Design a protein around this nucleic acid. Structure first.
Ligand SMILES: [Mg+2]
Ligand SMILES: [Mg+2]
Ligand SMILES: [Mg+2]
Ligand SMILES: [Mg+2]
Ligand SMILES: [Mg+2]
Ligand SMILES: [Mg+2]
Ligand SMILES: [Mg+2]
Ligand SMILES: [Mg+2]
Ligand SMILES: [Mg+2]
Ligand SMILES: [Mg+2]
Ligand SMILES: [Mg+2]
Ligand SMILES: [Mg+2]
Ligand SMILES: [Mg+2]
Ligand SMILES: [Mg+2]
Ligand SMILES: [Mg+2]
Ligand SMILES: [Mg+2]
Ligand SMILES: [Mg+2]
Ligand SMILES: [Mg+2]
Ligand SMILES: [Mg+2]
Ligand SMILES: [Mg+2]
Ligand SMILES: [Mg+2]
Ligand SMILES: [Mg+2]
Ligand SMILES: [Mg+2]
Ligand SMILES: [Mg+2]
Ligand SMILES: [Mg+2]
Ligand SMILES: [Mg+2]
Ligand SMILES: [Mg+2]
Ligand SMILES: [Mg+2]
Ligand SMILES: [Mg+2]
Ligand SMILES: [Mg+2]
Ligand SMILES: [Mg+2]
Ligand SMILES: [Mg+2]
Ligand SMILES: [Mg+2]
Ligand SMILES: [Mg+2]
Ligand SMILES: [Mg+2]
Ligand SMILES: [Mg+2]
Ligand SMILES: [Mg+2]
Ligand SMILES: [Mg+2]
Lengths: 117, 181, 143, 61
RNA sequence: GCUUGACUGCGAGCGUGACGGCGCGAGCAGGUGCGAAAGCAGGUCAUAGUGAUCCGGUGGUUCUGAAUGGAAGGGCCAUC
RNA sequence: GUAACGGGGCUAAACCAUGCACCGAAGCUGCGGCAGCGACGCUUAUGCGUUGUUGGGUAGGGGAGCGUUCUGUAAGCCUG
RNA sequence: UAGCGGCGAGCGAACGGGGAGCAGCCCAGAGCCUGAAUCAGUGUGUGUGUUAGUGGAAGCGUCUGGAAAGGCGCGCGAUACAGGGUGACAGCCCCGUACACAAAAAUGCACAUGCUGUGAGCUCGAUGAGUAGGGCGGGACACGUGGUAUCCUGUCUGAAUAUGGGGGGACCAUCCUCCAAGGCUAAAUACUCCUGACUGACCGAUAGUGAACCAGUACCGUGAGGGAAAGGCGAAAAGAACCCCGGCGAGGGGAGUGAAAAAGAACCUGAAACCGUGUACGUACAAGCAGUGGGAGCACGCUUAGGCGUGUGACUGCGUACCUUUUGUAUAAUGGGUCAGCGACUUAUAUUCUGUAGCAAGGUUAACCGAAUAGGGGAGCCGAAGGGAAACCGAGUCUUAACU
């Protein structure tokens, strides 16, 4: 038997162009270019799902270091103070606290000082 | 005898392929009517390389591997065939889809009479088999789609499956059991 | 019941469809790899082509001959020798019991398998233990 | 179309019981006087086909 | 000085090459030479001194012999 | 076109030696999930409870699937 | 397989067997009785077929609908429920199909017959000469001159006549068979330019013939020759009367037919590339495979009214397309302007291996017959026993005078 290809080809092309809506020009309109940029978008997605963790951790560490130097201590001595005070609060929650409630962070700094000296 | 599903499957696929006939062909780049002229010179131009209009990559060319009239007839082993028929009738009995009577005929070539007899026997999509063949009985069920009337020699396992119940002449049962042995 | 059939599992094997996609493994080149005479349309060595090096079928001596007598001799076991229609063994009736064939002129009665019945044997060559076995059932050497 | 036979291989070979083939040694049609009787006595019988060559004999059959 | 072991048929086993092959070999049967004997000798102290197959030459032959007996030819052994 | 630290810039932010911290990857750990290979008992890999382990990959080898056209099931089913 | 062969690649029989069909005769000659079977020509009759044909059954109501064959309820026919058409899917509306019939006229064939020819049967004998062979050279026999039978002969030769000749794979003898140098022969075998009926796991307008359509046309070429593209309104033209703008146009807005005009003759469906129009958001101190991740603002859509959802993406970290060939590419190495369609490991017979099914020291038929996948048919192939080059032997065999 002879099999024609139009419906299934149109389905695959339409699926890739659906995944490539919002791209510039032939990136949105042309299969030979959109099929590249969707795969490259997959590459960059597979990379940046990792890189969110690095980027948010260095954001968190920046905010903790800022608030610790506001309360008169360094980030390094602060983390060492928490590890010697046996404190397992992570940098996400510490950043959120150091933004919202300053006084709780100040008390944590004072506990780290007392655990340090 | 117990049912050998893969054996019966192989036999009925072979029977259907035997029903299939080999009527197809297309044309190659030998058989597409045209010329052996190279369409344009090998070099000089910026077009593609070119050798013949007859190639399938070109429009209005041949098929890359054209078809031939091929026989789909498989080879069926006689013991495999007969064991499939033994198993298929045993499974008909186990499904309670087989009825045996002495006599089954009617002395007039009338589908009205045949349909009334099948109503009296409560039968809808059935298979008739005989000891020897009656003129009027075959004439009364040629025109009936859900009913085939055959001689006990001319049997097929596919129509032994396909029809909802099978009814058999007792002389036909004797001939079948002699014919299988 | 006709739409209820599947064959034995692992009987029908799927088959190889080459050059029809990456995920098959048979994508580009389809099991044939990159460049080479093997990577061509009907690119193929003949049988026993070892390059220009003289192959094993060609650097050895050829020897022997065919007898035109062994092809019209044959060999006969002991089990068969019972299907001779009655109990006589001849150039005929083995030819007619279809064990040796028409063009056969000479025959031997080699020991192979149990022999059961007394059998008169006429006009053959007979081996040692098989002669003693034919005599153990009750048969006799006879030209 | 039945398979054509490599007639040279059919002349130089014959099959044994367990699927091996037999062959005849080289160095036995001419120069023999500068050779040793020990060597020619080694060469005179027949032998079996080796390991890597069975494909290149069975393909010839 | 004496001599033909630069004899034949075999080979447990080993080595070295992808393969064809190449090489080492105690020991068995026969039958020789040397020594009184125990023993030694299957060429040179060793490692190079070489040529596959096909085709055809010569000698021998418990092989075959296209109806049969022979022969021509083919094979096997030795060799060119 | 500076152009011989990536740069700004540095007398320490450079160099030698010592200590304690900290950052830092898809490595390691924590959680949740998938599959393969075992190893286990009810039971027969139909599965279930763990537990060990593995899971970058071209040519290339193997195993399992989806989707399209046509034939039987189909004078049955869906459909103005 | 045996053989042929730079014994390389390749070519590849015969014997013998199993089947469809089977059928035998005349002249080189005179007598004897003489149409006594044959065929050839010419007609007649019968049968049967071709070239036109004839009859050919039985359904209504309701509902959706532009339209009924569909749905529901109740019937009828069937040696016809093969197929096609009729406003969607019909056994009962139409043509047909099963069945039953038909020829003034020319024919095909098969019988029997009548008319003309030839020749039946018996005796006696006649038995195909520049022919069979042979030398040279080539070709065919599966056989390349090989130790090479056998046929044919272009050149040169050149026997015997039943006590004779030919072949039996160089050749000789024995033996076996045959009677050449003249001719005829049905069938079973091979092919489809054309006609009828039927089948298709063949295609469905880039497929299938080159051609579904005014195709071997338009067009190229002096010529031989090459060689396309292009199907579909709707069920029925009811193909748009009439009014208006515009140039007595092209085109359009209304009316109107129609179930439908966004089915209006470029006409079913109407994708994508490409090109416009409207809305929302962003962009005019900011640089680079244009994304991805985070994320402010803006506009809509939801509510359990916390915000989950979409469109946009100020700013920021990271970040040099794909294929191929490559040791290696962002590479300034190749290929691609883009879309859509087509396009590349198939087929037949052999061999081997795996998986699976059957049977089992057995398995299995092929060609053929056949109410034709059944059943016969077991001619043949493979396997159970090998060894040796082979005669030959056999659970042994080969080497060797001989093995533990
Ligand atoms: Mg778009
Ligand atoms: Mg040409
Ligand atoms: Mg076309
Ligand atoms: Mg074509
Ligand atoms: Mg691969
Ligand atoms: Mg390539
Ligand atoms: Mg290479
Ligand atoms: Mg390669
Ligand atoms: Mg037989
Ligand atoms: Mg072996
Ligand atoms: Mg020799
Ligand atoms: Mg000789
Ligand atoms: Mg002869
Ligand atoms: Mg740390
Ligand atoms: Mg990490
Ligand atoms: Mg990890
Ligand atoms: Mg885990
Ligand atoms: Mg992997
Ligand atoms: Mg009529
Ligand atoms: Mg009618
Ligand atoms: Mg309609
Ligand atoms: Mg004559
Ligand atoms: Mg000649
Ligand atoms: Mg179309
Ligand atoms: Mg107008
Ligand atoms: Mg248009
Ligand atoms: Mg249209
Ligand atoms: Mg700005
Ligand atoms: Mg960048
Ligand atoms: Mg590609
Ligand atoms: Mg290149
Ligand atoms: Mg490479
Ligand atoms: Mg790079
Ligand atoms: Mg560039
Ligand atoms: Mg480039
Ligand atoms: Mg280019
Ligand atoms: Mg495309
Ligand atoms: Mg059969």
């Amino acid at each position: 038997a002879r099999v024609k290809r139009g419906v299934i080809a149109r389905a695959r092309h339409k699926k890739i162009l659906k995944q490539a809506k919002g791209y510039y020009g032939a990136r949105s309109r042309v299969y030979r270019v959109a099929f590249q940029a969707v795969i490259k978008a997959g590459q960059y997605a597979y990379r940046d799902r990792r890189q969110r963790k690095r980027q948010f951790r260095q954001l968190w560490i920046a905010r903790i270091n800022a608030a610790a130097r506001q309360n008169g201590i360094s980030y390094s001595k602060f983390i060492n103070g928490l590890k010697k005070a046996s404190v397992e609060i992570d940098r996400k929650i510490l950043a959120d606290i150091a933004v919202f409630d300053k006084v709780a962070f100040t008390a944590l700094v004072e506990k780290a000082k007392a655990a340090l000296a | 005898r117990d049912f050998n599903e893969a054996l019966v499957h192989q036999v009925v696929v072979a029977y259907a392929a035997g029903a299939r006939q080999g009527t197809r062909a297309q044309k190659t780049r030998a058989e597409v009517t045209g010329s052996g002229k190279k369409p344009w010179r090998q070099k000089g131009t910026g077009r593609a390389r070119s050798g013949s209009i007859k190639s399938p990559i070109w429009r209005s060319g041949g098929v890359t591997f054209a078809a031939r009239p091929q026989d789909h007839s498989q080879k069926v082993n006689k013991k495999m065939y007969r064991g499939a028929l033994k198993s298929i009738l045993s499974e008909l009995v186990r499904q309670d889809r087989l009825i045996v009577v002495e006599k089954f005929s009617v002395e007039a070539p009338k589908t009205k009479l045949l349909a009334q007899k099948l109503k009296d026997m409560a039968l809808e999509d059935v298979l008739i088999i005989t000891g020897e063949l009656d003129e009027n009985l075959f004439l009364a069920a040629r025109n009936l789609h859900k009913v085939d009337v055959r001689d006990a020699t001319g049997i097929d396992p596919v129509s032994l499956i396909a029809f909802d119940k099978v009814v058999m002449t007792a002389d036909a049962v004797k001939q079948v059991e002699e014919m299988l042995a | 019941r006709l739409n209820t059939l599947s064959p034995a599992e692992g009987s029908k094997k799927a088959g190889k469809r080459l050059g029809r996609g990456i995920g098959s493994g048979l994508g580009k080149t389809g099991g044939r790899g990159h460049k080479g005479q093997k990577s061509r349309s009907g690119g193929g060595v003949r049988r026993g082509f070892e390059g220009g090096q003289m192959p094993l079928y060609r650097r050895l001596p050829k020897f022997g001959f065919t007898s035109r007598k062994a092809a019209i001799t044959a060999e006969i076991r002991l089990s068969d020798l019972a299907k001779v229609e009655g109990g006589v063994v001849d150039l005929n009736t083995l030819k007619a019991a279809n064990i040796i064939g028409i063009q056969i002129e000479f025959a031997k009665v080699i020991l192979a398998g149990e022999v059961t019945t007394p059998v008169t044997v006429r006009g053959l060559r007979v081996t040692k233990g098989a002669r003693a076995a034919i005599e153990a059932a009750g048969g006799k050497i006879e030209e | 179309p039945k398979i054509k036979t490599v007639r040279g291989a059919a002349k130089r070979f014959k099959k044994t019981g367990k699927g091996g083939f037999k062959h005849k040694h080289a160095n036995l049609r001419h120069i023999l006087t500068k050779k040793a009787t020990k060597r020619k006595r080694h060469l005179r019988p027949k032998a079996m086909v080796s390991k890597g060559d069975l494909g290149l004999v069975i393909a010839c059959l």
